[PDB]
């Protein structure tokens, strides 16, 4: 739901895998368990928790308070029923569905948000219900269930983009677009950060900037950064919050690897132990390394091992297997030679290869017109 | 009304009286004329609907449409109940 139980119950990832940080997460998880009817979530995740000595103490009170508030919402629903009104029943069934999202059961909340989803007099409250399924779909990390109601609720809006509704839907686009590895189309989503604000429902503003600084810092090149973020005053405002981000932006844009590799361990450790950002930690590292190697290797034709080793601050034995793996595996530039122990590339990728970029579509189109020949007579 | 009704003595005609919108007829038209624009979650439609008297339901449309301009002038994200009270004072001065 929109309560802080989404984040407190969202720390279960760092509560589960590492055993070092599993103390504060169970501290504010057990302390916050008396809030927002957290019984069923932590009872489901009880295998990753402590023993049953103190566990069975509060279950008897939470299981009876759940039935008490549940039967009070049922009596209020029966009082709202059999009466002339539309928003009253939507508020009763919607509040019941919000409590069923507090307990963390999407069966009665699925049929509840289905009933109040069918009682939507307007499309705005319908999109509000869709968002009510997205706020719990983030915790449930479902793929299609959160894209179906947004695919159906996306078209036929006709009421214009609000300041927090359409912007909130764009924030959700940042969420599921950060889950997926799509970057070249997700680089346009965070451009509306001027109208964004502190949203305690899903993600704080500083967490939204901290999450978009990876897709913006890695998924964008130097002209894209200079056009979007360097020209924009938003990162100039939010860089004063943490001095590290300014180092990872001015050091990367300044091409200083001696400090970027010394400080990159904070990006390595901070990159993991996250709910939605951990399983992609392997792609950001390699993609950022090959992006920096293409950045430095773009303006440089030949490169000696002395200036390279002093520039990157690492031994030659490691960059040997680095470029050796990035010739075939990386596929960034032409073949490299070591006849003089000097990185020397040619890169004839403009004159003839600029015309040869269409031969792939010519061969695939050739197989497609061979399929067109297969359609003939049958 | 007296001339047309003088020519229409209720022979074949549906007589439905059109009254001025009552309280509930101000809550529902306030919601129909409030979904189109922004609205906070800490506003009570009961009292703000009871504080919109005057001619008819177009006075509520004067509060909303003549309140979005104060949302523009104030340069805020949404419209608060105090802005709606200001528009109430404006439409009650225009009344």
């Amino acid at each position: 739901p929109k309560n802080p139980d989404l984040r407190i119950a969202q720390l279960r990832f760092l509560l589960s895998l590492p055993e070092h940080r599993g103390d504060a997460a169970v501290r504010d998880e057990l302390m916050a368990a008396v809030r927002d009817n957290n019984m069923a979530p932590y009872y489901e995740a009880l295998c990753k928790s402590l023993d049953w000595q103190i566990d069975v103490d509060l279950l008897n009170k939470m299981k009876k308070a759940n039935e008490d508030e549940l039967k009070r919402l049922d009596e209020e629903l029966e009082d709202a029923e059999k009466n002339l009104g539309e928003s009253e029943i939507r508020d009763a069934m919607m509040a019941k569905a919000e409590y069923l999202c507090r307990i963390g059961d999407k069966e009665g909340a699925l049929t509840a948000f289905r009933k109040t989803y069918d009682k939507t007099v307007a499309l705005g409250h319908r999109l509000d219900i869709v968002f009510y399924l997205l706020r719990i779909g983030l915790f449930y990390m479902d793929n299609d269930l959160i894209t179906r109601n947004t695919e159906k609720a996306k078209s036929l809006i006709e009421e214009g983009g609000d300041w927090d509704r359409r912007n909130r839907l764009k924030v959700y686009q940042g969420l599921y677009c950060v889950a997926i590895r799509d970057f070249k189309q997700a680089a346009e989503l965070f451009l509306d950060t001027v109208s964004t604000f502190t949203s305690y429902e899903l993600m704080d503003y500083k967490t939204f900037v901290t999450y978009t600084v990876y897709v913006s810092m890695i998924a964008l090149e130097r002209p894209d950064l200079r056009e979007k973020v360097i020209k924009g005053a938003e990162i100039l405002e939010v860089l004063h919050s943490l001095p590290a981000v300014r180092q990872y932006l001015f050091s990367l844009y300044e091409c200083r690897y001696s400090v970027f590799f010394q400080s990159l361990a904070v990006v390595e450790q901070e990159m993991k132990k996250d709910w939605l950002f951990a399983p992609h930690y392997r792609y950001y590292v390699r993609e950022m390394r090959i992006h920096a190697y293409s950045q430095l290797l773009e303006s440089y034709r030949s490169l000696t091992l002395g200036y390279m080793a002093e520039a990157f601050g690492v031994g030659v034995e490691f960059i040997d297997q680095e470029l050796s793996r990035f010739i075939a595996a990386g596929r960034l530039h032409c073949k490299i030679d070591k006849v003089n122990e000097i990185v020397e590339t040619n890169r004839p990728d403009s004159k003839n290869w600029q015309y040869q970029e269409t031969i792939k579509k010519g061969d695939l189109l050739l197989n497609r017109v061979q399929k067109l020949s297969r359609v003939i007579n049958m | 009304i007296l001339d047309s009704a003088l020519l229409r003595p209720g022979r074949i005609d549906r007589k439905i009286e059109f009254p001025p919108p009552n309280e509930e007829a101000r809550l529902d038209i306030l919601k129909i004329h409030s979904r189109k624009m922004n609205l906070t979650r800490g506003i009570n439609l009961r009292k703000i609907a009871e504080l919109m008297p005057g001619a008819s339901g177009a006075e509520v449309k004067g509060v909303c449409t003549e309140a979005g301009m104060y949302a523009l002038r104030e340069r805020r994200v949404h419209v608060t109940q105090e802005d709606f009270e200001m528009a109430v004072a404006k439409v009650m001065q225009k009344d």
Partner: peptide
């Protein structure tokens, strides 16, 4: 091939003119 007219034309005319899609983001 006064200040009533200057204020009304001011906020009703030049304020919507200096913004794009403002019609869309004012509750048209």
């Amino acid at each position: 091939p006064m200040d009533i007219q200057k204020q009304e034309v001011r906020e009703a005319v030049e304020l919507p003119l200096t913004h794009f899609e403002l019609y869309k983001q004012i509750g048209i």
